[PDB]
Amino acid sequence: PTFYRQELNKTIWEVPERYQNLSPVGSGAYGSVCAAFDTKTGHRVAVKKLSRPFQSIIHAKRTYRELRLLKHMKHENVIGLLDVFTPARSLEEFNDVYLVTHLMGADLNNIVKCQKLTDDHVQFLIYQILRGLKYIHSADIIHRDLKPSNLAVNEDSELKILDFGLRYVATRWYRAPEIMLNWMHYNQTVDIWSVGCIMAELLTGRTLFPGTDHIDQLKLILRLVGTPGAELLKKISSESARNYIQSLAQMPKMNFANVFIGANPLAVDLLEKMLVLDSDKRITAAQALAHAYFAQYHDPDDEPVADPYDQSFESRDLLIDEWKSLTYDEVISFVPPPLDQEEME
Ligand SMILES: Nc1nccc(-c2c(-c3ccc(F)cc3)ncn2C2CCNCC2)n1
Numbered sequence: 001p002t003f004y005r006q007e008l009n010k011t012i013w014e015v016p017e018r019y020q021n022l023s024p025v026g027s028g029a030y031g032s033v034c035a036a037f038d039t040k041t042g043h044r045v046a047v048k049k050l051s052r053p054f055q056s057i058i059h060a061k062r063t064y065r066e067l068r069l070l071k072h073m074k075h076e077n078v079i080g081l082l083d084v085f086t087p088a089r090s091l092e093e094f095n096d097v098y099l100v101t102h103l104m105g106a107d108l109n110n111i112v113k114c115q116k117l118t119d120d121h122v123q124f125l126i127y128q129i130l131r132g133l134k135y136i137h138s139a140d141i142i143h144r145d146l147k148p149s150n151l152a153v154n155e156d157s158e159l160k161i162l163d164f165g166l167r168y169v170a171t172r173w174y175r176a177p178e179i180m181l182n183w184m185h186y187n188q189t190v191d192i193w194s195v196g197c198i199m200a201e202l203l204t205g206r207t208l209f210p211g212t213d214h215i216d217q218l219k220l221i222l223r224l225v226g227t228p229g230a231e232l233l234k235k236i237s238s239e240s241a242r243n244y245i246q247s248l249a250q251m252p253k254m255n256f257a258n259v260f261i262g263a264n265p266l267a268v269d270l271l272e273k274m275l276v277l278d279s280d281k282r283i284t285a286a287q288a289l290a291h292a293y294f295a296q297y298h299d300p301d302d303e304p305v306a307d308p309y310d311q312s313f314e315s316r317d318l319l320i321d322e323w324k325s326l327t328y329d330e331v332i333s334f335v336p337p338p339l340d341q342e343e344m345e
């Protein structure tokens with residue numbers, strides 16, 4: 001294929017002639033993204049150029065990690081790969097990686113910002129997040145930083161999770177307490193806490209826990225969910241942190257019906273099951289999909305799990321050129337999916 005060069009975001013992109021009319025649509029994880037027209041299919045795509053993919057073993061392994069993950073993801077609510085390309089003609093020339101997916105014009109902040117959503121629409125948005133999470137969680141992949149800006153949405157409110165599983169000042173308002181505060185154990189339900197925070201904000205138009213720092217955010221959380229038991233302290237390494245929490249004036253759990261006034265009582269019930277401090281008592285994604293709040297959308301035949309995903313590489317320290325060669329292998333072996341991968345139920 002013939003490549004062409006274009007300066008985008010102050011740097012040269014080199015892309016196959018297949019992709020035309022590139023226009024910047026923002027940064028992504030370790031890279032920047034342009035929308036483009038795929039002349040082969042007439043589809044609109046998003047092309048991510050990785051920034052310095054092989055600068056160090058940290059960059060090189062994260063490049064491999066991202067390509068492996070995206071090659072594995074085949075779910076309608078999860079970002080996956082239409083194409084992956086490099087201008088390099090051989091491994092010796094290989095220093096640039098571009099990833100291609102379907103174009104999603106907005107993030108979730110674009111959906112709720114200027115639109116009072118209906119409850120039926122909120123149901124659909126949260127349902128899609130949970131379906132995507134069921135899939136990634138089934139492959140032992142956790143997001144860990146799920147938030148509105150990591151949910152890509154198209155013109156018809158179809159949503160995909162991105163930037164999951166990936167060892168600048170980010171918002172912490174949606175992070176699970178066990179992540180934000182570096183507690184000693186956590187599971188896949190870290191992402192369910194984030195869903196609760198997202199859903200609360202879609203229903204009320206207000207950030208649920210807009211803390212100015214980690215301590216202020218914890219205080220806002222405890223005012224809603226109540227002071228934790230001694231059992232929860234088991235998970236916290238720092239004595240100063242445990243002593244502080246234990247020292248706080250005790251607060252009762254709020255009745256969520258008094259917090260989310262006017263909301264669908266089924267929404268309030270689901271929120272009560274998601275926004276619990278004990279990650280072992282938090283509802284899972286698969287359980288949440290069965291909740292009556294989503295009754296009009298739920299379809300067990302269309303909520304699939306993932307194929308087994310081999311993450312053995314995560315425990316390995318390899319040399320930079322080994323990660324580079326493995327990444328090159330994954331670029332070369334990529335098989336684009338069929339354009340139409342779905343059939344009427
Ligand atoms: N517009 C759009 N559409 C789809 C995805 C993205 C995208 C990607 C990305 C990931 C993999 C890939 F192969 C191609 C692109 N990474 C971050 N973003 C974001 C860019 C702006 N914030 C929301 C989406 N952006």
Ligand SMILES: N[C@@]12C[C@H]3C[C@@H](C1)C[C@](O)(C3)C2
Pocket residue numbers: 021022023035036037044045103
């Ligand atoms: N520059 C564009 C803007 C829109 C998305 C993508 C990139 C395809 C296009 O045809 C419409 C051109």
Ligand SMILES: N[C@@]12C[C@H]3C[C@@H](C1)C[C@](O)(C3)C2
Pocket residue numbers: 154155156158
């Ligand atoms: N339902 C959709 C939403 C976006 C615009 C248009 C209609 C084409 C599509 O592929 C992306 C599907």
Ligand SMILES: N[C@@]12C[C@H]3C[C@@H](C1)C[C@](O)(C3)C2
Pocket residue numbers: 207208209210220221223224259
């Ligand atoms: N966003 C808030 C933060 C605190 C807990 C809960 C949710 C009730 C509230 O009045 C205080 C607003």
Ligand SMILES: [Ca+2]
Pocket residue numbers: 299302345
């Ligand atoms: Ca269906």
Ligand SMILES: [Ca+2]
Pocket residue numbers: 301345
């Ligand atoms: Ca069916």
Ligand SMILES: [Ca+2]
Pocket residue numbers: 340341342343344
């Ligand atoms: Ca079809």
Ligand SMILES: [Cl-]
Pocket residue numbers: 072308309310311
């Ligand atoms: Cl695998």
Ligand SMILES: [Cl-]
Pocket residue numbers: 310311312313314
């Ligand atoms: Cl592996």
